Amino acid sequence: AYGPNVKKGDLVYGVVHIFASFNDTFVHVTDMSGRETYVKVTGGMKVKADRDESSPYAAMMAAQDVVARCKECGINALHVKMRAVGGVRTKSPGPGAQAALRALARAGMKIGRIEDVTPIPTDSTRRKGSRRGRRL
Amino acid sequence: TTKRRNHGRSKPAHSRGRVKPIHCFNCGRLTPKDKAVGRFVVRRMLDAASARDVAEASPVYGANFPMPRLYMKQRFCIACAIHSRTVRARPVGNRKIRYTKKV
Amino acid sequence: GQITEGCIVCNVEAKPGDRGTLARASGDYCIIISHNHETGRTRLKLPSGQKK
Amino acid sequence: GFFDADLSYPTVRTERMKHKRRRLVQGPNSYFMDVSQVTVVYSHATTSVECSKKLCRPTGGKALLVEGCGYRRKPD
Amino acid sequence: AKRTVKMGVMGRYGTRYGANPRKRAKKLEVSQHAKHFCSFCGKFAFRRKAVGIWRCDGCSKTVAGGAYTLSTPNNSTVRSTVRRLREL
Amino acid sequence: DTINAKLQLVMKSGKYVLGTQQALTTLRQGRSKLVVIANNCPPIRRAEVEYYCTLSKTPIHHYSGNNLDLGTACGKHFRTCVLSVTNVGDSDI
Amino acid sequence: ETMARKEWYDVVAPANFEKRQFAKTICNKTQGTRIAADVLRGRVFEANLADLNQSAGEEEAYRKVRFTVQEVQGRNLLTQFHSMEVTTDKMASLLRKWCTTMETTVEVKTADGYTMRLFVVAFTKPQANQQSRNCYAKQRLVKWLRMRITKMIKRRLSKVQIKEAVSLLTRNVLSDALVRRCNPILPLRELRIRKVRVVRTPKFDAQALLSAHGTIPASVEADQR
RNA sequence: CAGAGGUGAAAUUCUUAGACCGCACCAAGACGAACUACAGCGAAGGCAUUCUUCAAGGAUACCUUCCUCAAUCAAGAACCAAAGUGUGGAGAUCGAAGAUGAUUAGAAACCAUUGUAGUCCACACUGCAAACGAUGACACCCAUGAAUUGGGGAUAUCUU
Ligand SMILES: [K+]
Ligand SMILES: [K+]
Ligand SMILES: [K+]
Ligand SMILES: [Mg+2]
Ligand SMILES: [Mg+2]
Ligand SMILES: [Mg+2]
Ligand SMILES: [Mg+2]
Ligand SMILES: [Mg+2]
Ligand SMILES: [Mg+2]
Ligand SMILES: [Mg+2]
Ligand SMILES: [Mg+2]
Ligand SMILES: [Mg+2]
Ligand SMILES: [Mg+2]
Ligand SMILES: [Mg+2]
Ligand SMILES: [Mg+2]
Ligand SMILES: [Mg+2]
Ligand SMILES: [Mg+2]
Ligand SMILES: [Mg+2]
Ligand SMILES: [Mg+2]
Ligand code: NA
Ligand code: NA
Ligand SMILES: [Zn+2]
Ligand SMILES: [Zn+2]
Helix, strand or coil, X not given: CXXXXXXXXXXXXXXXXXXXXXXXXXXXXXXXXXXXXXXXXXXXHCCCCHHHCCCHHHHHHHXXXXXXXXXXXXXXXXXXXXXXXXXXXXXXXXCHHHHHHHHHHHXXXXXXXXXXXXXXXXXXXXXCCCCCCCCC | CCCCCCCCCCCCCCCCCCCCEEECCCCCCEEECCCCXXXXXXXXXXXXXXXXXXXXXXXXCCCCCCXXXXXXXXXXXXXXXXXXXXXXXXXXXXXXXXXXXXX | CXXXXXXXXXXXXXXXXXXXXXXXXXXXXXXXXXXXXXXCEEEEECCCCCEC | CCCCCCCCCCCHHHHCCCCCCCCXXXXXXXXXXXXXXXXXXXCCCCCCCECCCEXXXXXXXXXXXXXXXCEEECCC | CCCCCCCCHHHHHXXXXXXXXXXXXXXXXXXXXXXXXXXXXXXXXXXXXXCCEEEECCCCCEEECCCCCCCCHHHHHHHHHHHHHHHC | CHHHHHXXXXXXXXXXXXXXXXXXXXXXXXCCCEEEECCCCCHHHHHHHHHHHHHXXXXXXXXXXXXXXXXXXXXXXXXXXXXXXXXXXXXXX | CXXXXXXXXXXXXXXXXXXXXXXXXXXXXXXXXXXXXXXXXXXXXXXXXHHHCCXXXXXXXXEEEEEEEEEEECCEEEEEEEEEEECHHHHHCCCCCCCCEEEECCEEEECCEEEEECCEEEEECXXXXXXXXXXXXXXXXXXXXXXXXXXXXXXXXXCCCHHHHHHHHHCCCHHHHHHHHHCCCCCEEEEEECEEEEEECCCCCHHHHHHCCCCCXXXXXXXXX
16 A cells, blocks of 8 residues: 555665664654654553663664554664764763664575664763762 | 882873873863873774674675774773773883784 | 944945934944845844844 | 903994094084085085085084085195 | 152042042042043143043144043954955 | 165264155255165155156165154164255165 | 555656666655755765676775765656765774874865865875884975975866866776876875765756756556556 | 663653754864874973964084183072963863752752853963972093984985
């Protein structure tokens, strides 16, 4: 019913934005301009405890929910953009980034090009904490 | 009792007055840039198992075209460097060993 | 329309031919922000801080 | 080795490497040249020297001679 | 000899109006009675007549500017900006 | 500046005259060799002096300072708007 | 349901590229006084240069190009060049420690308007027989190098149209000329243009847009299945 | 389109009146990552984007000039991180005081969400620091091996 008018074997590309912090994981599929979104599932929509929203298992479940529904749209290939929190906070990606990308590949989607798009300042504002840091 | 000849940093007596501080990569404490422990790391996005799953499903990445990596310059305060095992306390004789290149 | 953007002005006409009604008290002025050639209008910052 | 070094009669190899004010008796480093009218030019000139055109260019060290005029070092 | 220690021209007020208000008014009082340099001609002969009005003893020229000083600091910036924009 | 160096040579070796009225007198005669005008000169007075120089074909130099600077550059303690050098001694200009 | 009211479009690139109809997108169908063409105009699409010039080799795989929609023709979206940039991984892998990094910014205007900003970068290298621990550069040579780059870019790009200027940047012609003429000043390990952005555009001209697109391949999105 | 944030775990807090997330923009105020080093400049305090501009400072080169004009100091003078004070601006970020969640026997603290004065600029004060090399200034002699920054002298490599 839906999907572009193409042959049954052609590839139609989307872009999936994977945001993985230490508190959650986002799996978000848009078109190649970013102005239109197809689906968006987060790790917090799959688990019941706050401490599991960033686990690799929750990211795996979110990705499968994305594939199981975007197949109706007619999208079957994805370019990948991954990011950490960035800015003045940490630049190391969260635990769920690895598991989310692998789940999409094993679910049937083709994988295009991969890039890291973490925000990087050329010079920054001051970050939270004192000059002594977080004393835990 | 003076423990180190360079006092734990890289500022000789008649070279500079002040070096601008930076925020610790982990806790955020301010440390002079010449004192903090710096490391340049190059990490792969995916481990060996995940990489082969992604590569087979890609018309782009394969034997000829490698996958991209992450590049980071990390600077730590002394407490965070010790707690993360980046450096460890050493016996008095061995404290003067220095390395100039990644080993 | 003939004054470059970013200029300092005084004795500004609110309406054409009014002979000057804005920025007249001692030490005051207005700042030109931008022009719109399609609409034929100009944006100003007033001494009070408002934009007109 | 095997040669005893006398302080008051240093060897030519040793004395040749010293700074001009660190020799046993200090002395100059510069000299005079003539170029070809014929004029005399200082080896470390810093002003402008004219023939009719400029003959040398000032430099942080020795002056730079123009190409197209022969030069010869004068004795003493 | 010197006739006062701290308050030069404010000594006409006696002990009345308070130390800080007297101090703030002294700086502007001194400025409005001094002689300022005249770019026309070459003399220090600019005197204020009324608020914002200055007249040169030598040039006999009248200039409009400044309540208590011949030229305000904000005016100097504006002249440079206008000159730069004209040269574009 | 190069002009200031020459003025000092003239001030000690040559002959000169200070003031607009005396400078014009030298221009009416033929003794003037160079006329220097400060940038702080009334516009109508400058135009009259320049007209005299054009008629008599006298070189004219526009000084980069005001009449205060021109007087200081001559070693004087007063202001001069116009300078005229009748004799140049041991100087290029 | 969302996709009960969406319609598919095609995004076509100017004639300088081999792959004309890259990417597809969706938009709401016209309802009432809200016109789809008004929303569509002005969107920016990003693609990888190796996919556009599929005949290109390996250096094109590290650059991405952006296009902005200017007009809607049936189910086709006609675009104009917007910007170009090196990928983050490629750029971050070029820095080494004991050398010096040199950066310049150049702003030029083409014949038909279209002001743009250039952002060049370069690195020093040791000589073949060098033994020193570093290859830092003198500041006087860095300034001289920056001046020569600015002069060559302004002179070259101010005499051409926007279409030809893109071809110079895309097909790796301008950078090679810069490297050849800048090595005599200072031995360079690498010189790249890392980011081009269009800052100001002229007034819209329908005929100018059509002359830049040649023959437009026909879209089949509006037909029956 | 239903959650997001935050933690060891949570809760104060935001959200179908559309939060979080995605793309291109607009405004304002700070700051100049990677390159950045037992490297450079400065009397000390201090000083990292580019172009234009103003006055300086040190080193080197010299068969230029001069001829004891010097070293170090009570009295006296100038400069001096941060916090603090006064009067005008500015107010993004962070954040003494204060507020609200937790933790705890208690917690006024450490942790979380916020937030006033401040943090930035101009002019005027203040004159204190682990203001440290915990090492006063000027001058002489003094063993060895690799380096490094700037200038100069003498004699196989690359680009043009
Ligand atoms: K919205
Ligand atoms: K050298
Ligand atoms: K050397
Ligand atoms: Mg601890
Ligand atoms: Mg030093
Ligand atoms: Mg200090
Ligand atoms: Mg250290
Ligand atoms: Mg070097
Ligand atoms: Mg949450
Ligand atoms: Mg930088
Ligand atoms: Mg302060
Ligand atoms: Mg204040
Ligand atoms: Mg205030
Ligand atoms: Mg806050
Ligand atoms: Mg707090
Ligand atoms: Mg309690
Ligand atoms: Mg110390
Ligand atoms: Mg002490
Ligand atoms: Mg040096
Ligand atoms: Na493959
Ligand atoms: Na504030
Ligand atoms: Zn730390
Ligand atoms: Zn006057």
